[PDB]
Design a protein around this ligand. Sequence first.
Ligand SMILES: COc1cncc(-c2cc(F)cc(CNC(=O)c3cc(N4CC[C@@](C#N)(C5CC5)C4=O)cc(C)n3)c2)c1
Ligand SMILES: COc1cncc(-c2cc(F)cc(CNC(=O)c3cc(N4CC[C@@](C#N)(C5CC5)C4=O)cc(C)n3)c2)c1
Ligand code: PRO
Ligand code: PRO
Ligand SMILES: [Cl-]
Lengths: 469, 478
Amino acid sequence: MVTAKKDENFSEWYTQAIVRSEMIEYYDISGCYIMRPWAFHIWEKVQRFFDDEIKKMGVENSYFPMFVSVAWVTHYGDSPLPIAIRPTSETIMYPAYAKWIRSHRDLPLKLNQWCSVVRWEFKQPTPFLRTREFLWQEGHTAHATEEEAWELVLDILELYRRWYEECLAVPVIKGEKSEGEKFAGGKKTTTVEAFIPENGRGIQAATSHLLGTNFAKMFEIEFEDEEGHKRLVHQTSWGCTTRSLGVMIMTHGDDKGLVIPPRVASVQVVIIPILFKDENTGEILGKCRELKTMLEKADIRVRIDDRSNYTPGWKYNHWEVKGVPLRLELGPKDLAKGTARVVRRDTGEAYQISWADLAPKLLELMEGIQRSLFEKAKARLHEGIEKISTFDEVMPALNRKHLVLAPWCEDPESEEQIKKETQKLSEIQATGAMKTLCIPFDQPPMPEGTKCFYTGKPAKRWTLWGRSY
Amino acid sequence: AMVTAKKDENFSEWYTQAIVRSEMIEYYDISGCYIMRPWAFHIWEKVQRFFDDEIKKMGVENSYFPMFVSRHKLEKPEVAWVTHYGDSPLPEKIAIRPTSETIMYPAYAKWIRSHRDLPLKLNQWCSVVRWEFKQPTPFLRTREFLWQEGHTAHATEEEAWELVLDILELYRRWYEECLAVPVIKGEKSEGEKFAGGKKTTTVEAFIPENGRGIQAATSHLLGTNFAKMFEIEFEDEEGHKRLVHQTSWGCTTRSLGVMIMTHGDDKGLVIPPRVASVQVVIIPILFKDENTGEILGKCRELKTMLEKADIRVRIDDRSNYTPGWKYNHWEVKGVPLRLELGPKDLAKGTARVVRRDTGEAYQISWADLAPKLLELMEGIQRSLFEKAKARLHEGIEKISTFDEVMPALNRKHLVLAPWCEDPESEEQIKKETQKLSEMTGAMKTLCIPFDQPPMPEGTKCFYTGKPAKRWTLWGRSY
Ligand SMILES: COc1cncc(-c2cc(F)cc(CNC(=O)c3cc(N4CC[C@@](C#N)(C5CC5)C4=O)cc(C)n3)c2)c1
Ligand SMILES: COc1cncc(-c2cc(F)cc(CNC(=O)c3cc(N4CC[C@@](C#N)(C5CC5)C4=O)cc(C)n3)c2)c1
Ligand code: PRO
Ligand code: PRO
Ligand SMILES: [Cl-]
């Protein structure tokens, strides 16, 4: 049972929740975490969704080696050798792209791979959020024109919005990264950002880069034109990781533990026979089995927790901590009345449902839960953003654990200065630096001559700032 | 580009040409590692979806464990050691997984307390690293490869062994039902067994052109051995602690290599319809604007019709290539069926269909296309399998004495021979066969087949002269 309370002791709540739900297991190498089925199934679900969608775009999967020509591999079982793990595979894939692309009809080229990457940062580790090894997908495409590459950047970003909002019920904000926060060596980075109210931090949910021609020039990825001229390809890359699971956990969880959106939950309905220690005669479990078969006919994912020793209250708490969206209780009166009691995890509301009506009503409830989780989260996102005009509004907003939307001149040195000055102010108040999250695609109007909230120069666009992961 | 090496003359060069010119493989600066290009990955995804669906029906759940393993857990030459980060040594070196028993089973020891926690059935899809010094072979013997490894724990041995056999049957289906590759079920010798395990079962395949057997997949009864070393125990119903009974089982991208080698021909790849991401490629014949728009439109209608019968169709309407180039391209890639549509076909209300495996052409009315192509695809799948099965049967000589061994090996055949099953004799046979051969010429056991021929009373071991125990399949091998 989760005993830390989410808003009072958030990091402790997160650690308790992810372990007591059986999502992760600890490991004797720092920064590495076992993904148990309760978490991994969620990965399987968003992976299937995204993979189906990119295949509709003509992206095809592949596998490139994990060794880059540095985590050095010096020996093979104490036989020394005469290596380097991928943090990301641009340098692994792009020589191959230079080889594969010769003329305009070789384009576009669109590849994806699902794999794990290793990033051995010294800083402190947190499961799903920032780890030594994590799973992701990385897509890399090359196009004859910049317009086509940018169109794909935006299509992928929309797919990421759907990954978060339709699968995980997490609202995100589409936007463009500042010059200082864009991918190294690219033209323009787009992103979807999420918000964590309990610590007021923005977090990058996924990222989709217009690399432009810089990588082509560096790796000599050229193609011959239709008129016979050598031209550089225009490239993109885009990635999204198991950090999505962390965001989902933080968005929907409450004081009792996780809440898993029905669309991705490994079990959608747990059937809990109200049986005590020697009560097994087959009457309750039989109807439990019948109900499982019926519900599975409607493509509902069901488990019966028929484990001998635990009380019904133990099982209720166990499955609430895991965050299964619906619980179906079947005990003796239920059996004698022909009904079952269903409790939905997000609100605790209970329904007495006739056995005939179970599969429809549950489908209904699941849609309700999934929509409600999104709408409540979207409302919290909206209540977490203060639209300001001047710098004196910044520190107050940050102390309410909010982000700010402010008019900005988009000068990069100004972003560095704002980082340093908000860090300074935070230490004197006693990680406190505030930085840009994105420049949202949805731009409110910019009245003529609006001043940048920090520099006083002419503002160019509304920019989203906050403390960050 | 097209294949020009002949499969029955320079087999190695033929294989290299077939995997490169079909766009399956790309070479890499780090020896023993290859890029797996999309055309190969499509086949991998087909067999992966099949096997994953089937183990999900058994209650196995997917998971993901770390790629790194500590020195103590690993050792409770193949193994790659991360020893430095930059110029600095790590305080303690850590290893990249060659296999995950030592990574998963400490967690198993912690998760299993009661008979109510069993069975525990997990799988993961990942890659592993076995860094041998010798010459690699794309797909078949590589330093990094993709696989699935399944790991289960049970309250009884009988239950674990049932699961071992059920997984082995899934591997038979993977090879024979999906890839159309015949395999032989059997049990490994004591010396070829998984180290630490109790009993290893296997499906073995055969490569006729070089005479070599190769393990296609493997399913181990670990028994209680690993439960002992990792202290994986459960309380039964009367409060007594018992060790669990364990299995582990794996299958890799080697299967793609075996498929290639089995069905490929002088024109290159031949993909069995069941694992072809493109079963039918439609090639519109456009020459000097003879009815361009109408031909393209009819191609799209035919694709929709075929898709409704679940046929996997691609229209190659790419402009910058000729029809003849498209023929060669999709041939070397092994697409099972090519459909051609031109002005003549447009008028007659028909299409011309060429099957990759034999080259036989058919003229088919549009209304008949779907049932006829479903039939042809079933026929191609079954024919690939049956021809390979005959080649496998012709590549095994049943013998009784050692003096028949070297002739049979020189015919590039395997031998099925009665054997006493003492391990010393397997080492002795290996050494003598190698010496007589004069890339290894040695002969080792491939498996003791489940399907045992009769053992007449008093049959002698082909090598020691002691009483034979069972028929054992031997050969040169990968
Ligand atoms: C940022 O300052 C830090 C502060 N405090 C601690 C750390 C830290 C500590 C460690 F011990 C180990 C690590 C290494 N892991 C990662 O860097 C990382 C990055 C991402 N990322 C980065 C952005 C991205 C998106 N969208 C990219 C597309 C991929 C996405 O998901 C996801 C995960 C799970 N892990 C970081 C780092
Ligand atoms: C035997 O002396 C040799 C002679 N000549 C060359 C080598 C060699 C050279 C290398 F450069 C790299 C390697 C390492 N790769 C592998 O050993 C290997 C094993 C398997 N295996 C082993 C059995 C199994 C089955 N079924 C198990 C389920 C897993 C299955 O698929 C699959 C693959 C793709 N690679 C070996 C070794
Ligand atoms: O690390 C990144 O952000 C880019 C996009 C995915 C692969 N590399
Ligand atoms: O390497 C092997 O043979 C076993 C089976 C898969 C996991 N370990
Ligand atoms: Cl946290």
